[PDB]
Structures are given as C-alpha cells and as structure tokens.
Design a protein around this nucleic acid. Structure first.
Lengths: 252, 119, 126, 140
RNA sequence: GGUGGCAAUGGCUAACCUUUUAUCUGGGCAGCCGAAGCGAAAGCAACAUGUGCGCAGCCUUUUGGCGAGGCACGACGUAU
RNA sequence: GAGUGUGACAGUCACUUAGAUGUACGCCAAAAGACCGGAACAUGUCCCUGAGUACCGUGCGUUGGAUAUCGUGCGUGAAUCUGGGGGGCACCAACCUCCAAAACUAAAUACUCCUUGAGACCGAUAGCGAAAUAGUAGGGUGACCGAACGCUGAAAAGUACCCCGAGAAGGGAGGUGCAAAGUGCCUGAAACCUGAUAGUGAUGGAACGAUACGGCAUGAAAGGAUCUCUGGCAUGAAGGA
RNA sequence: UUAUGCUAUCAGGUGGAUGGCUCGGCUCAAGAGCUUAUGAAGGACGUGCCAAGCUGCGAUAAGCCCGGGGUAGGUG
C-alpha cells in the first residue's frame, strides 16, 4: 500500500502511496510468455546459402555397375548433391525466410509486466531468485538519486541502502561460460543484480551504467525481460519518486 | 586500436593479425615507471631498441636491461640478459612481449621521441 | 485426487487456479461439503470449457439476494434488475459495474469459501 | 510431427515404408478426383460439381447494417450516457446514421419511449416501437 | 486440442510512427472475425424464455423439492 | 565491468572501451545580394487547343476481364467548344465526370560487387567448391566438371658431443623443455597389424550368447565388514514326508 | 615351450576420429553505389641477390615522386 522513501544516505524521509500497478497478482506463466516473446522478437535470421551442396551437375550412374544409385560427378565416381553424400546439401536446414517472431497481445503483455512489477515487491521472490540484499522491499528512493553523476556516488547510495553486496556478488560471479559462445563472442556468463528505474532520462542512467549486473532504465523503457530476467520474477529494483509517480497508469 | 564497434572475437583477432605496421608500432607499448609516468603525463609508451626496461612477468621478472632488438611483425623485444642457452651451449636471446616489461629509463637520442610518447 | 486429477492440476498453469483447486479439495474434506469438490473438478476440466456466463442468464434465473457460484468468468451482456451476490473466478469490467450498480457483491471463490465454508444455499451457474 | 518420439521407430508412424511416397499415397494433388474416387470426400467437404445462381455487381449490391429493437432498448441508456442518443422529456432520441445502422429489426422487447430515426424499419420493429410509446422516423 | 489475455459497453491490430541501432515502450479502428438469418436474386427479417423432463449442487422429513448447464417441445424469421 | 592480446581465468599489463579531439581535397549549407517575372476581372456571328490518331470490323496472343483487360496484324476510319471522351453488351435519353492521341519531373521503392555492424548460425567429412601457392591440382577436343590438405613449443631452447652404420639415411647413448610435443610435430579412438600376458588347445561340432554350477587367473582405487563362509537357536506361508 | 589357432586385456605401429582452439564460411541489418578510347575489366608474358607458386607491379616492373599522419625500424 505505502512505502517509505530513503534519501541518498539511506534513511526513510517520507512516505509514498504505491500505484495500483503494485497490487497485481503473480503470473509466472504470463511472465514466461512475455520474456519468451521478447527474446524471439530479438532473434536473428540465419541459414545456409541458397544452393549450398547443390551447385553440381551430378547424375546417377544407374544400375549395372555395382554402385549405389546416388548422383555422381560426371567425370568421377564421387557422389554429390545428396544429403547423405560428403559435401552434399543439408536436408532441412534453417531458412533465413523462417519467421521466429512471437506475438503477445498488448493487454496480456501489460498484465505480465504489472505482475512482474508487483513481484519486485515481494521479499521472498526476490531472495529466492538469487539476490543478496538487506533492505526492506520495495525500495523507493528520493529523486536526488537521479541527479548523481558518478559511479562512486552510486556506490555510496548502494552501500547506504544495503544493496552493494548484490552488485559485488554479480561482479565476482561473472564467469567465462562453457562452449561455442566464447568463440561466437559470448565469453562471459553475466549475472543480473539491480534494476534502477528513473522518471526520465537523467544523469543516473549513465552514472550507474557501469555497475556490475546493474541495469538503469526509465519507465518508458521498462519491459518484462528487465523485470524478470530468465522468465524469473523477483528482481531487486530501486524505484525513484518520479518513477513511482509516473507508474500511475503505466500498464493499466 | 579496435573500437567497441566490433565486440566479436573474430574481428578483434583479424584486426590484430592484419594490423598495418604503423598500428603494430603501437603494439610495442609498455607501462612507464612511476617517475616516467609522472614526468611524461602518460601511463605507457612504446618500447624502443636501446632504452632500459624491467621485466615484471615470466621467468625473468625483475631483470633490468637495454632493448637489444624490436620485431614489429612478431610484436617482440630482445633485452640484454634475457637469454636461452641452447643445446650447443651458446646463448640465444629470448624474445619478450612488451606488456610483460616496464620502462625504467628512456632513450632520448631522437628529438621526436617526446611527441612520439605523447601527442 | 489420483493420477487423473494430478495430471489435470499439473496441466493447469495459473497458480491461482492450482491453489484454488487444492484449497477447494481441502475444504470439501474438512467441511464435508461436496460443493467445493465439484467446483474443483469443474476447474480441473479443460479451460476451453470454462463457464462464460452473461448477466442475462443470472437475471433470468435469479431472485433478490441470490447467492451464485460461477466456475469461470462473468461477462456483461444483458441487464441485472435485482441485486445478487456472485462468486466467480473473474469478472468483466462491465459485469463488475453492472453487478455493483444493481447492488450485488462481486466476490471471489476464496471470499465465498471464507464467507460460508459449508456452501449452504449457494447455487452453481454455468 | 514429434520427430523425437519417432527417433528409433523406423517408419515414423507411416505404417509400411512404402507409404509416404508422393501424391499417389494421397490419390493425387490438392482436391483432385472429386468426380471419380474422391466423390464422397467432395460431398463431405463441399467440393461437389455444379454451378448455382448468379452474382450481382458489387457496385449495385449492398448489405445493410442491422440492430434489433431489443438491443436498442436495453442499451439505450448507454447510448445516451455515451453521447450517441439523448433523452427528450422521457423519450430516447436515437439516430442510426451516427451509429452506422441503416435498418432497425424487431427482435426483442421495447420497454421505453423510443424515438428512432433510421433509413428503414422492419414491420415488427415499427409496431414494437409504436406500442412502446416511441416513434419511427424515415431518413429523407 | 492444452494453457492463457480480454469479452457483446466484444476481440485483435496490419502497414506505419516512436528504437535512443533489429529488442523494447507508447501509438496506429484501415481492416478482419463475432454481433441475424434465409434466398440464385429482388427482397424480407426472428424467443433478453411459453411449457415439460432432469444431472450436478443445495435444501429436505432420505422421500421429495428448487434445479445453472443439458435434453425435449412450443413459438417465430426467411426460401420453397 | 564491450572485447581481444599478453607463458592459466585481466576494469586497473598492452591495444582498447565510455567520452572527447583533429582532419587536406571535397559535400551540404544558412544570412545577404543579381536576374526573366506574377495575379484578378469585363466584353465576344472572333481565333487556337495534338490524325491513318480516337473509334469500329475481323484474326491472333495475353488477361480475372467475363458479349465488359491490354497488345497489334490486316481492313476501315471521324469531330473540332453549337466540340470530343468515359461512367464494365449495344443503342436512346437524363445526370455525373473529364480533355487523350506530344514532353519532362525529386522522395517514399528494388538489389548487394563493395564498407561497417550483428548473430539461440557452422566449427575443418561442418560452414562457400575453396580457414588456402582454390575454380587451384586434376578431368573433358569443347560447352564444362572439379578435389584433398588447419594446429610443435611459453620461448627453437628445432637435440651439442660420442659410438655403430657406406651414409648429410637410421639407430644407440646423451641432452633441451613443466611436458617430446622431435618439424604433415596438440589430443591420438576404432578397424587393421606386431608382440606380451590370462585362459584353453592337435578325439573335436557351428549364431560365437543367456541362465545355473565348477577349474584356472585376477579381484590396488572406485563395491560389501553382522559384509562373505560355516553352523546353532526361535518363528515360519503354500506345501508336507 | 601344444604348433597352427581361438577369446579377453595390455604394450607398440598404422591411421586420423574424438576433445579443445580457430585470421574462414554463411545469414541478416545499416551504409555506399557505376566504370572505359586520357585505352577499362580480363588474360598472356615479364619483374625478386639466392624466387618455383600466389600476390603486387610493368622493361622506372613485390616497385618511383610529392603532401599529410606515424616514428624506429623495414625488406608481402
């Protein structure tokens, strides 16, 4: 219903009545749908070239030679063009014309977003989802958090709020992943720690940007994958006064 | 130089491998000592044949010597005293990476060296 | 609750529905009230066949101060002349407005269970 | 199909491997054979041979949007509160032109004084509106 | 089909704009489906329940009653 | 705190990165000037306003274009503001609408040799045929068809000297190196081949095994310690001398 | 010491799978988009101290001249 507001030193200096977006029931299925839809819409087309394994003029020898009826090169016995021939085409490969985009209705997507926002208030979900913190949820900060311009200032605020331990666990649990992702450019497996939500584009977006595991966004740029990384709700989030004021009819 | 335009390992390694010679010059950079960095305003400079550096990583940490040679294609330097004794028994020099050493004395016989190191 | 009932429950994805089914079976146990187990089986049934009851059916078949249990959603087609209390799984916005203006109560299955655990006098509408 | 479940089944649910070859295993391509061997299937799916009737040009043929007097009566108050209708000393003044309907039909009940202007009315709608105390107005 | 959002005061948007580099957020009612059918067409245009049985559920004197949904009629629109 | 290199995992070692700087020739480009000039109405026995064109007959193609698409072969063939065309068969009438048979015209759009970026893409029989001395070697008179082949090590420190050997082969011995990883060198499976070890074996019967019981060998780790062996005692279902 | 053999394991050879690595490939997006008689693209031949292929170059022949950035190495 109501939440205390903490100054940059971390002390409650007032009250704010939480909007109706915060008393929304918990819908893990819809959160899963929203996150999967966002990932699919982010996904990228791929596939082999048009005639890969197929630019040969190979034809079969027929019967009467003691060999399989597969197409062969016109001037050698090397088989070609068939999916079970060496150098042959992939049978049923990925198509660049394949459509991986998912549609979720706007109403149920906003319902899922509201569910995730309300899940950001429950201490049990947030701690079950892996975060380390000692504050009392939800954490609403006075607007002067948005005006601080340096990572050191963000560190001071997080330490005063008892949130820097989750940034530290994210930093020291960042780890090089196993497999081909390293070669493809996904060398590390990163953790998610803290979601700062600001009223509008302010210096805090840039000041908190480099924090390990931290995402800093505005209410306009708030979505299901930010509020529930990996389809798991219970994200540790710092709301600002402007953000709480602007969340009045954000998804209703 | 490789910008955050491309964060892909393939493009980074391609850029390094096909770097031109004027870019491989910058690959010879090494950390300056505390006095040198204070009195130059930059934290690093390119190792040159002749100046004294201290090796701070590898089998030869702590050795100070003059750069005998520099290979830009290999990205290696040859320092007085950093040698491998071969099966003959003769001493061949062991090439080092400039990022494993620290400049303690600069060679300033070239008037262009100051702006070369900075600006 | 055997393997069939557990298959249906595991099939359901809404945690509210799952908790409702579990608590309904618990109350059918403790209170000795088959109303809750019947509602639980109706909710275990496929979601494509949930009740979608318009206001017109309620108005047609209800009287003053009638206590209604709708295993599903209440929709807002029609008029409701008399006030009637309706415990449903969900309500349309227009259904909520119509019931409130007519003077009935728009409560949930949990609320109706807490209001009267024996289920006496409640009548089920599909 | 579920390829994973059929990994190891050989025939993959097709029966004999001689099934699942080409259009011969479907009896031809598309909805072919509707006169000879897919005659009963064409009967079932509506692809039976024949023509019927004639088409009038779209430029002269028109369908009319409709609304029943029951619908008008039992959402007349919504119409007035939303602005598409007004109450003139007890009579709901409804104009169908701004609603998008050109014919009022007579299904349902009329329980209130309802002055409805439209391009056309059914006869039962006429009598129901006039017995309810309202009136019917023609669009000139 | 299973699971969901919304729901006759219905549902969803398409292209497109908003990207601050393909996500995303907010827009976008054109359109489609539903909302009335029958008839080739002209055209005309229906039950907000009149009756019965009855499952679950509830009540009950444990035999009956009420009985959503369901079933069977009756009535009505249109074509012949 | 994108990433890559650096003797093993790097925000602080290096290049970078965030963010700022600079940049010749060019490209766009505002203020401010020079220049041809633009827009209404009145009057009307006045003048002009696109020809083998529009239309039509017939044949053919094409089209959803149906007597109602467009094209063009042949034939035929107008009118001039009191005019001409269209309004899905023709004609008549009313109404509505336009002015062809001459011409130009940015933008929104298509594509990918090329540049940059990205990727639930492939990872050396895959992914382009080509990780390339690859359209190469090679094949076909020709049109044309078309491969295989990536990797020592942190650093060559790429094995001194000695013995054997015809040897600038090779082997032995001896070194280097954390490790031979000893140059088509990381790892180094199986098939196949050589040898050793266990069992068996020149009187023996074949889907090469399953089950039970024995001989021989092994049974360090990862398996058991009221576990294994051998007995006693109590209770013991069906059954039952 | 029972040979020729058979079965299992082990050591070695052959071979190049597996694993790991990868300056390559593929697809998508955003840019940019003509050139040649002032002789283009493409090809032949030549061109390196020891140089055969590729690549670059053209008898001035893995190259020559001028201006800027870069600065201590370079000789694909």
């Amino acid at each position: 219903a109501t939440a205390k507001t903490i100054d940059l030193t971390g002390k409650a200096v007032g009250e704010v009545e939480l909007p109706a977006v915060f008393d929304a029931d918990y819908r893990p299925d819809l959160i899963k749908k929203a996150v999967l839809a966002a990932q699919a819409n982010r996904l990228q087309p791929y596939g082999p070239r048009l005639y890969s394994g197929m630019e040969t003029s190979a034809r079969g020898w027929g019967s009467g030679r003691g060999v399989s009826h597969v197409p062969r090169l016109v001037n050698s016995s090397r088989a070609a063009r068939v999916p079970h021939a060496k150098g042959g085409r992939r049978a049923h490969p990925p198509k660049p014309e394949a459509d991986r985009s998912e549609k979720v209705n706007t109403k149920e997507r906003r319902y899922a977003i509201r569910s995730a926002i309300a899940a950001t208030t429950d201490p049990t979900l947030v701690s079950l989802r892996g975060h380390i913190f000692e504050a009392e949820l939800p954490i609403v900060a006075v607007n002067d958090l948005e005006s601080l311009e340096r990572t050191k200032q963000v560190i001071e605020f997080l330490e005063a709020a008892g949130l820097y331990e989750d940034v530290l666990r994210a930093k020291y649990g960042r780890h090089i992943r196993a497999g081909r992702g390293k070669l493809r450019g996904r060398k590390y497996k990163h953790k998610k720690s803290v979601l700062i939500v600001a009223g509008e584009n302010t210096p805090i977006l840039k000041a908190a940007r480099n924090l390990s595991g931290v995402d800093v966004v505005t209410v306009d740029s708030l979505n299901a994958e930010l509020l529930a990384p990996g389809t798991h709700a219970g994200r540790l989030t710092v709301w600002t006064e402007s953000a709480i004021g602007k969340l009045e009819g954000a998804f209703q | 130089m490789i910008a955050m335009v491309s964060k892909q390992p393939r493009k980074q390694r391609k850029a390094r491998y096909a770097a031109p010679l004027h870019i491989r010059q910058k690959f010879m950079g090494a950390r300056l000592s505390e006095a040198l960095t204070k009195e130059y305003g930059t934290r690093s400079a390119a190792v040159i044949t002749g100046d004294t550096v201290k090796v701070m990583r590898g089998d030869f940490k702590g050795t100070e010597g003059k750069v005998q040679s520099v290979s830009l294609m290999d990205g290696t330097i040859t320092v007085d005293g950093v040698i491998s004794t071969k099966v003959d028994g003769t001493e061949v020099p062991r090439p080092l990476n400039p990022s494993n050493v620290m400049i303690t004395k600069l060679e300033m016989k070239d008037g262009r060296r100051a702006s070369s190191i900075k600006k | 609750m055997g393997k069939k009932s557990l298959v249906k429950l595991t099939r359901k994805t809404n945690p509210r529905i799952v908790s409702l089914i579990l608590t309904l079976k618990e109350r059918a146990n403790g209170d000795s009230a088959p109303i809750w187990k019947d509602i639980a089986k109706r909710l275990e049934a496929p979601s494509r066949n949930y009740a979608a009851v318009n206001i017109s059916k309620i108005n047609r078949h209800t009287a003053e101060d009638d206590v209604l249990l709708i295993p599903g959603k209440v929709l807002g087609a029609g008029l409701l002349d008399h006030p009637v209390t309706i415990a449903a799984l969900t309500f349309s916005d227009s259904a909520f407005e119509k019931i409130t203006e007519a003077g009935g109560k728009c409560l949930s299955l949990e609320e109706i269970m807490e209001a009267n655990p024996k289920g006496s006098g409640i009548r089920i509408f599909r | 199909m579920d390829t994973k479940k059929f990994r190891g089944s050989r025939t993959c649910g097709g029966g004999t491997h001689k099934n699942r070859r080409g259009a011969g295993n479907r009896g031809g391509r598309g909805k072919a054979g509707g006169c000879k061997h897919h005659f009963v299937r064409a009967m079932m799916r509506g692809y039976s041979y024949g023509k019927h009737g004639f088409k009038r040009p779209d430029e002269v043929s028109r369908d009319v949007s409709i609304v029943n007097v029951g619908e008008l009566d039992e959402l007349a108050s919504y119409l007035v509160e939303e602005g598409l209708a007004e109450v003139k000393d007890g009579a709901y003044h409804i104009n169908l032109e701004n609603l998008g309907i050109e014919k009022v039909l007579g299904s349902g009940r009329v329980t209130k004084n309802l002055v409805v202007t439209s391009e056309e009315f059914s006869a039962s709608a006429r009598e129901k509106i006039e017995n309810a105390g309202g009136s019917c107005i023609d669009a000139e």
